[PDB]
């Protein structure tokens with residue numbers, strides 16, 4: 001990296017230099033070791049997330065606990081599986097490791113987003129009929145691109161998030177989104193039928209029925225995709241539940257807030273979800289706007305106690321991409 005070089009220069013050189021490959025490790029190494037950390041900006045599942053600048057340009061750094069190294073590798077590994085890059089998927093910049101033994105430091109660097117997580121966004125905000133769609137349409141677009149299975153040269157294998165939720169989604173300045181945190185992600189090769197990975201992972205609350213009650217067929221890939229959809233549905237709930245059509249809107253709430261306690265359990269969920277077959281209360285008066293209803297329609301077609309019945313990211317993308325046309 002010679003003088004004058006900017007992150008902007010590095011990103012461009014990559015996203016236009018043959019293979020969808022990232023920057024050379026050597027370069028990633030340099031970037032990481034020269035990032036100037038600003039301050040911590042979040043914790044969670046595995047590792048604390050910091051805000052940092054490289055030669056001035058903001059950037060996001062996810063510093064891992066030496067103990068959660070597996071999550072570290074899975075992300076780095078998965079993002080470096082051909083052209084995973086995508087407008088609706090968090091942009092990988094570099095991955096690095098320093099020190100050794102008990103004090104090994106593992107870092108992942110990504111793009112920075114002032115607006116932060118969809119979760120922190122929906123909390124301190126009230127979206128419009130407009131945005132409510134950009135947010136969902138994009139989340140959909142992304143999940144669609146992840147589950148997609150571009151076969152061929154630099155095509156991408158099928159990918160299942162396994163931990164999709166509001167905290168793992170970020171929003172940009174123009175109101176779009178992008179999935180994040182592939183720590184649990186799972187690849188699936190079609191030319192050999194496989195899946196590099198393995199218990200009951202992911203955030204309890206957003207867990208789908210087939211997983212909560214343990215019966216999910218981990219041998220069939222689609223099964224995972226199905227679980228993603230169910231979650232994305234809970235996410236859509238969170239979004240619209242915060243839309244504001246004429247001053248009217250409900251306080252931000254996590255799925256199953258009024259049912260299960262704060263920070264649920266695998267047992268406390270198997271109850272409210274599997275058995276009692278309960279889903280986020282779709283506001284009655286939610287049948288005002290045509291689009292606002294299209295959502296609930298989908299939300300219902302995602303929460304089916306049967307994975308096989310639920311829609312698909314692609315489909316959801318289409319009907320949403322459509323609503324984008326007519327509405328607004």
Ligand SMILES: COCc1cccc(-c2c(-c3ccc4nccnc4c3)n(C)n(C)c2=O)c1
Nearest residue numbers: 060061062092108109110112113116167168181
């Ligand atoms: C390959 O890089 C992965 C990576 C690096 C740094 C942070 C994150 C990350 C973020 C993230 C990403 C960008 C941000 N920009 C501004 C403020 N916070 C951010 C958090 N979130 C919300 N989660 C769950 C993550 O794993 C992922």
